[PDB]
Ligand SMILES: Cc1cc2nc3c(=O)[nH]c(=O)nc-3n(C[C@H](O)[C@H](O)[C@H](O)COP(=O)(O)O)c2cc1C
Ligand SMILES: Cc1cc2nc3c(=O)[nH]c(=O)nc-3n(C[C@H](O)[C@H](O)[C@H](O)COP(=O)(O)O)c2cc1C
Ligand SMILES: Cc1cc2nc3c(=O)[nH]c(=O)nc-3n(C[C@H](O)[C@H](O)[C@H](O)COP(=O)(O)O)c2cc1C
Ligand SMILES: Cc1cc2nc3c(=O)[nH]c(=O)nc-3n(C[C@H](O)[C@H](O)[C@H](O)COP(=O)(O)O)c2cc1C
Ligand SMILES: Cc1cc2nc3c(=O)[nH]c(=O)nc-3n(C[C@H](O)[C@H](O)[C@H](O)COP(=O)(O)O)c2cc1C
Ligand SMILES: Cc1cc2nc3c(=O)[nH]c(=O)nc-3n(C[C@H](O)[C@H](O)[C@H](O)COP(=O)(O)O)c2cc1C
Ligand SMILES: Cc1cc2nc3c(=O)[nH]c(=O)nc-3n(C[C@H](O)[C@H](O)[C@H](O)COP(=O)(O)O)c2cc1C
Ligand SMILES: Cc1cc2nc3c(=O)[nH]c(=O)nc-3n(C[C@H](O)[C@H](O)[C@H](O)COP(=O)(O)O)c2cc1C
Ligand SMILES: Cc1cc2nc3c(=O)[nH]c(=O)nc-3n(C[C@H](O)[C@H](O)[C@H](O)COP(=O)(O)O)c2cc1C
Ligand SMILES: Cc1cc2nc3c(=O)[nH]c(=O)nc-3n(C[C@H](O)[C@H](O)[C@H](O)COP(=O)(O)O)c2cc1C
Ligand SMILES: Cc1cc2nc3c(=O)[nH]c(=O)nc-3n(C[C@H](O)[C@H](O)[C@H](O)COP(=O)(O)O)c2cc1C
Ligand SMILES: Cc1cc2nc3c(=O)[nH]c(=O)nc-3n(C[C@H](O)[C@H](O)[C@H](O)COP(=O)(O)O)c2cc1C
Ligand SMILES: [Cl-]
């Protein structure tokens with residue numbers, strides 16, 4: 001058949017960098033979403049506290065296949 | 069913990085301007101959503117009728133914290 | 137009243153071109169969403185197999201009116 | 205029939221803010237254009253004099269239906 | 273000589289897809305503008321009614337040579 | 341002479357809307373910068389608390405003439 | 409292994425519309441290239457002659473897998 | 477009063493470079509438009525013939541004050 | 545009160561990757577700036593020497609609260 | 613002399629994150645290209661399998677000096 | 681060591697074209713700044729008086745190395 | 749027939765300005781590519797040495813007709 005996908009936007013966070021934030025966001029998404037297929041980073045930001053990075057914040061679009 | 073956020077897109081409307089459209093959209097969003105944290109305006113448009121602005125239409129991304 | 141809209145993102149697919157992909161995606165969306173009002177194409181991509189287009193993939197934002 | 209629209213670009217101005225600049229620009233546009241249907245804000249700028257905003261300047265695309 | 277061009281923006285519409293909307297818009301443009309040379313699609317949108325595409329709406333920039 | 345300008349980026353805030361945030365940011369800028377000439381809005385965001393807008397946050401580029 | 413891809417840019421053309429231009433460009437690309445995997449449309453333009461579309465011109469990025 | 481501006485798009489051309497193309501386009505514009513105030517370059521392109529630049533082509537937005 | 549922020553642009557560098565470049569840039573910024581609040585990555589580039597990455601170069605906007 | 617550069621686009625991949633994908637892509641590029649000088653990340657995407665990141669995919673522009 | 685750069689934004693002006701505006705802006709910047717390394721043009725605009733270009737205005741980002 | 753074009757990216761350089769950089773890049777391209785048809789400037793940058801512009805660097809897309 002011709003599949004249809006849905007694309008949602010999430011932000012993963014971690015003090016431990018860009019990869020960790022990506023992985024953390026996607027891990028949360030996978031808990032309650034099915035048929036995840038791809039992601040696309042929209043932005044990399046972070047929150048600073050006392051001059052240090054408290055959290056990296058990576059905004060992602062996440063695409064998944066819609067069930068019939 | 070490391071929080072994960074979800075970002076949805078809504079359009080608020082009002083005949084009474086940009087601020088009123090923002091506030092209206094966000095008020096509707098708050099009724100059913102929880103843990104709203106930020107918004108970002110994507111566009112400001114409007115519908116014209118008889119040469120006057122019938123509604124300002126303000127598209128926003130709205131970020132909220134996901135529950136575990 | 138002043139209506140509020142929600143805008144989601146979907147990808148329609150078809151081997152039979154851009155229009156067919158748009159129509160297919162929107163047809164799937166219409167099965168489970170109500171009060172669809174507009175769409176906006178975000179991108180036109182496709183997957184190639186053996187040098188031929190296997191599927192056109194058209195990403196759309198789709199706006200609909202929120203119920204009270 | 206299948207309508208065709210024309211989209212022009214104007215800048216509305218006012219010392220009294222974004223909404224006033226939008227409304228002012230559109231009011232001028234309505235005097236000499238017919239069948240105005242929508243607008244889209246392109247930018248919000250302003251001119252400063254003696255440290256104060258002398259005019260808000262709101263650039264808009266304005267769409268209208270072409271007559272046959 | 274060194275030619276100068278003017279670029280206007282129009283929206284073509286059709287229920288019958290992207291190509292039909294492009295062709296329709298350009299056909300209307302050709303009736304009252306001369307020396308049309310090129311177009312560039314700016315966006316592909318559409319209006320939905322009862323879950324179906326009522327009109328594809330294709331916004332184009334259209335360039336033409338200015339007469340002396 | 342041929343003037344040179346410098347362009348800085350600031351964020352004005354206010355609970356009372358976009359215009360108030362713009363005006364507040366620019367008022368602060370005017371206290372310590374001279375020869376302010378123009379501004380350009382880069383983004384309109386805000387912070388939400390208990391479902392309400394606590395502050396509108398308007399990011400602006402601000403241009404001023406450099407002294408010799 | 410971890411694959412590496414190369415992305416080139418081509419323009420397909422046809423008087424017969426967007427899909428035909430895409431297909432034509434990709435067919436030419438396939439003649440000399442191997443392991444084509446995806447495309448992404450960058451722009452849709454066209455050349456006008458005597459008020460009619462002489463060619464649709466569809467610029468695409470085309471990704472393919474690099475051989476070792 | 478609060479002035480309203482109109483912004484049109486033109487392309488100036490010259491074999492003799494970017495400045496010459498800008499100046500040429502604007503000179504043509506000035507012949508039939510009044511109260512020209514500013515321009516903004518949108519793109520710099522050119523046509524190549526026998527490996528040489530036949531014309532630089534500079535697309536500009538041109539803003540002018542609307543008369544009452 | 546209603547706070548005002550200033551946003552500057554810096555480039556952090558490191559041979560040891562994106563996170564290291566971010567952290568390095570921000571560490572330098574913190575030495576001579578106060579009340580750092582957030583950053584936003586603008587670009588990730590790098591310099592190549594003998595086919596290897598000599599430095600990752602991460603351009604960031606950095607926002608901080610202005611003192612009264 | 614005045615050097616001329618060529619800029620190509622590649623996608624590096626790795627299951628082990630953004631830096632690893634960058635390094636992998638560039639290592640492949642260096643095998644068959646000479647005088648590599650810089651890169652610029654265009655996008656960070658990835659493929660998901662069973663809810664996990666199978667590969668990070670980092671699209672880069674890569675600039676190199678052309679030989680005479 | 682790993683250098684950190686700062687990037688500021690300036691506008692150079694000249695009646696004598698794009699190159700002259702660039703050179704003028706950068707010459708002013710060099711008078712008070714140290715370790716200038718690169719620039720990137722952001723926009724080319726100009727002010728028109730009596731139908732002629734009074735000043736070309738070239739906005740640049742200018743990067744320089746921060747001292748320890 | 750329906751022609752297909754290929755679009756490559758090059759950077760021309762010169763100490764003598766934007767036009768000279770464009771012309772230099774294109775002259776180098778013409779030595780080893782055939783059927784050059786158009787260019788589009790992507791960016792204007794430069795390298796600064798001792799406070800002066802050592803080279804203007806103009807990145808261009810260059811389109812050419814593919815042979816059968
Ligand atoms: C324009 C703007 C953008 C911001 N972006 C972020 C962000 O990306 N991540 C984040 O954690 N906080 C962000 N913030 C919140 C700030 O980091 C900070 O927590 C807030 O402004 C309060 O700071 P203050 O106590 O110095 O006033 C942003 C604030 C503003 C005004
Ligand atoms: C390209 C395009 C963009 C539009 N954008 C908006 C919009 O932002 N807000 C809105 O209310 N209507 C929008 N519309 C709908 C028009 O405002 C209008 O209601 C519709 O085209 C019917 O107008 P007509 O009766 O003159 O044909 C848009 C229509 C087109 C074709
Ligand atoms: C940067 C990038 C973008 C891609 N975009 C698409 C796409 O738009 N549509 C699609 O079906 N596949 C897309 N893919 C997946 C590829 O088409 C392909 O299926 C995958 O990379 C495996 O190809 P390979 O077996 O040659 O390694 C993309 C892959 C990469 C790396
Ligand atoms: C890059 C640039 C952008 C400008 N944008 C605006 C604008 O948006 N609105 C406006 O009224 N003036 C704008 N101006 C004009 C300035 O506000 C100002 O009136 C002009 O540069 C003269 O200022 P000076 O006397 O300090 O040299 C702009 C000028 C430059 C150089
Ligand atoms: C942000 C926005 C964008 C819109 N874009 C379009 C469009 O591209 N084409 C169109 O025909 N109508 C457009 N519309 C109008 C809607 O399709 C719809 O006709 C209008 O909002 C009334 O819908 P409702 O009766 O559900 O409130 C737009 C409306 C909004 C708010
Ligand atoms: C991607 C992102 C963007 C943000 N943008 C803003 C902003 O524009 N303004 C602001 O005040 N805070 C911004 N924040 C901070 C949030 O509003 C919020 O204060 C912070 O994430 C803590 O929320 P939590 O306690 O629900 O985890 C941003 C945060 C993230 C992750
Ligand atoms: C800014 C600009 C953009 C153009 N884009 C296209 C294009 O996308 N496709 C095309 O075939 N020709 C394009 N052209 C070429 C024109 O369509 C036309 O063939 C050329 O300008 C000569 O027209 P003239 O004889 O009216 O001067 C472009 C020309 C200019 C100046
Ligand atoms: C995607 C595209 C963009 C073009 N842009 C321009 C342009 O900016 N200026 C111009 O004079 N011609 C432009 N053209 C027209 C070409 O320069 C050329 O005149 C036309 O494609 C015929 O070339 P051919 O005889 O090699 O097929 C463009 C053509 C295409 C397909
Ligand atoms: C368009 C362009 C972009 C460049 N971007 C970067 C960069 O992001 N980081 C960097 O270290 N050098 C950058 N450079 C400098 C080059 O990496 C290189 O050091 C310089 O061009 C000299 O190289 P060559 O000796 O091969 O001529 C750039 C150069 C050009 C022309
Ligand atoms: C719009 C779109 C974008 C995609 N982007 C990527 C990508 O960046 N990387 C990738 O490996 N695959 C990409 N793909 C391919 C998907 O990840 C997936 O492999 C393909 O759609 C088949 O999934 P399905 O079996 O659930 O239908 C993309 C597909 C679509 C439709
Ligand atoms: C949207 C907008 C953009 C402008 N951009 C520029 C600019 O780039 N450079 C400049 O010198 N002036 C700029 N101006 C100022 C105008 O050129 C002009 O000096 C001002 O609007 C007063 O013109 P008027 O007397 O016709 O009302 C801009 C004005 C507006 C409204
Ligand atoms: C973010 C970034 C962008 C750069 N862009 C350019 C460029 O466009 N052209 C160029 O010649 N060099 C470019 N460079 C290289 C610098 O001009 C400079 O040669 C290099 O960073 C070494 O400078 P330093 O000795 O002060 O550390 C860039 C460097 C960075 C970090
Ligand atoms: Cl959503």
Ligand SMILES: [Cl-]
Nearest residue numbers: 212280281484
């Ligand atoms: Cl127009």
Ligand SMILES: [Cl-]
Nearest residue numbers: 416417620756
């Ligand atoms: Cl290439």
Ligand SMILES: [Cl-]
Nearest residue numbers: 348552688689
């Ligand atoms: Cl600054």
